[PDB]
Amino acid sequence: SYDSSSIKVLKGLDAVRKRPGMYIGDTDDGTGLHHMVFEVVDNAIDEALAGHCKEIIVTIHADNSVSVQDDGRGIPTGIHPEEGVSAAEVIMTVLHAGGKFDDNSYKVSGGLHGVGVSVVNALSQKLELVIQREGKIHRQIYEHGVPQAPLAVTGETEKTGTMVRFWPSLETFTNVTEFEYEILAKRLRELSFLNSGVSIRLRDKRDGKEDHFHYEGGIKAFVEYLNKNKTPIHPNIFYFSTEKDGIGVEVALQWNDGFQENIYCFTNNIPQRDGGTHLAGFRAAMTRTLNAYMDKEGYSAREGLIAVVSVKVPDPKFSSQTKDKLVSSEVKSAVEQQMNELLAEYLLENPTDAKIVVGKIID
C-alpha cells in the first residue's frame, strides 16, 4: 500500500497553499496575513533601491483587500522567451522566478528567492495586477493564483509603475483576518526612515485615516524617533553612510538614561531579528573604539543604547528563508572597519557627548 501512488507532486502554487508555514508563516495570529502586504511593499521598495520608484501608496480598502501602487519601472509585460506567457504572469505563477538572481536589474534588493509575490498570489482569493510601462496600461486578474486571461493592454499612459491589489483567501488565513492599520504603519514608517526621499502613503478607506511618511532625516531621524519617549543623555546622534567594496553601511546611534539595549539591524531594508554578521561587526567596533578612547583620554557598554545598522549587500546569505540572521562573513569586516574609523572621529569631534557617554559606561 506504500507505492508509487502514495507519492504526490504539488504543482505550481498548490505547494504554497498546502504548506503556507514554509512561505508566509503563521496563518492564525495575523503575522502571516500582514506579511502578505509586506512582500508586495518590499518589491516596491526594491524599485526604490534601484533608483526608480519615488512614491509608494498602500491602501486598505473597505472590503478588506489591500493595494500597493508604486511608480517604478513596472513588472515586465513582454512574452517570456522560455515560458511562452507574459513575464508578469511568470512572476505571479512560478516559484523561483524573478529579476534578482543577478545584479543586472537591481544592484541590491531585499528580494532574494524569487517567491514573494507568487506566494501572495497563491494565498489570495483574488489578485488584480495593473502595470504601466512602454506607454501602455496592462491588466490581469487572478483567482487563487489562476489567471483569468493573458495579460492584456487596455489603454495608454505616460506613467510607469505597478499596482497589486489582493483579497486574502480565508481558506488560508484564520482568526486574525482583518488588516490592522497600525501594524502596517509601523513598518511603513520604518521604511520611510530607511529610504529617504521615497514618499510612502498609507490610507484606510474603512475610516478615512491617512498618513504620509516622508521623513527628512533618514536613519538619524529614526534614532531620534526611537528615543523620543526615553531620555536621551547627549544631543548629537552619531551617523554615517558609506559604500566600500560593494557593501553599503549606514549606522546611527544615541544613548539614553535607561539600561536596555535596542539595536535594529537591516539588510537591504529587511530586518534581522536574530542579528548576524552586521550586528557582530557593530558590537566589535563599539567595544574596541570606546576602549581606545577611554585609554587615550586616560580613564581606568551597550546599556541605554539605541542604534540602527542598515547594510546594502549585493548577494546576501542568510541562515534560513526567513532572513532573520545574516551570515555573509564579509559584512562583519565591512561594518567593523567603517565604524572604528568614524565612531573614533565622532568622539574627537563631539567631546561633550563623548564625556557624557563615557561617564555613563564607567557607572
Place this chain on the structure above:
Amino acid sequence: SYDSSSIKVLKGLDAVRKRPGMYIGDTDDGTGLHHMVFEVVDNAIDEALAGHCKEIIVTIHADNSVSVQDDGRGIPTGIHPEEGVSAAEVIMTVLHAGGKFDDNSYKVSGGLHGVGVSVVNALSQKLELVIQREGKIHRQIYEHGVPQAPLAVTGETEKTGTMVRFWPSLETFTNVTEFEYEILAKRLRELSFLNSGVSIRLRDKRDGKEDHFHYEGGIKAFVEYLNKNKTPIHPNIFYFSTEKDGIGVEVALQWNDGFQENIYCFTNNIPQRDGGTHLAGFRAAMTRTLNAYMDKEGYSAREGLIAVVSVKVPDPKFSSQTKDKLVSSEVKSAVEQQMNELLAEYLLENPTDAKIVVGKIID
C-alpha cells in the same frame, strides 16, 4: 533594459543550488553540511515512526561521503503515473513531492514539505541510491542531482530498505567541509532516546570508531543522561506517554540542584529551538499543578529543571520552514491537559520527591 529577458526561472533543483540558505541553511559554518545527513536520517526515522524500520546505520566513509541505510519499506520504485519516471526519481529531483502530504503512508512524520532529500541530492556532487523492496534491488546514481540512467533492477533480495550515500558538493559547502563524528553522534543519541527499540549505529571508516545507540529507557533515560553531570535532587524521574484526539504527548522531567532551566521540545522527533505551543502547554501545566499541590498540602519554579517534551502531531504547523517553533494551537491544550492530570498523580505517588522539589522552589 529591465524587460522580459531580465526574468530568470530556476528550474528543478537549480533553485536549491542558487539559494542554499533557504533549503539547507549556512553553507560555511558546518551546520548546513551536517543538516544534509540529518535530512536523510529523519526520513529513515519517519519509516520507524510508521512502524516499519528497526535499524538505521549511518557511516562516514573515508572519502568524506556519508551513507544512511535503513530497513524500512523502501522508497517506491514504480513508475509515477503523472510524471512518467520512477517514483524514486520523482522524490530525488522534484521539490514538493512526497508521501507525507496526507496520512496514508505515515500517520505522523518529521517530513512535511516534500523537499528534504531532493535538497540533499541537489547539493551533492554525487548521490547513490539503492532500494530493496518487492524482492528486488534497485539502483540509481545522480551527479549534481542529475540521474545517470533510470532507476534499474540489478539483483534479487529478500530484504527491504533504502540506502542513500552522498558526496557533498564543494561548489556549495565551504570552510567546514568534513563531517564531524560528534555532531552526528549527538543527534543520533537523541534520536535513540526519542525512538525506543530502533537500533541506530554510527561508524567512522576514517578511524574505525563506532557506536551503537539503543537506549532502553526512552525519554526517561534521556533525562537521566542530561542530568548525569549535574546533581539530581530526587530519584524518581517523572514520565508519561499518552495519545488522545490524535495527538501523542510524551514528557519526562527531573530537577537538579542548579539554577538553569533546560526544556527540550520535539515534534515528530524534530527539535523546536524556539519552542511554541507544546512548550506553552508544558509551562502552564507545571505552574498550575505545582501551585495546586502546594496549596492542598498547606504551604504559603523551573530553576534546576531538565525536561523533554516530545509530541506526535498528524499535521503540524510551524512559524517557518525551519520548524523551530510549533504554532499548532491545539497542541497547547493536549500537553497541558495530560500533564495537569499526570503530574498531579506523580506528586501524590512520590511524596519524598514532591517534598524535595517543593522545598527547592520555596527557596
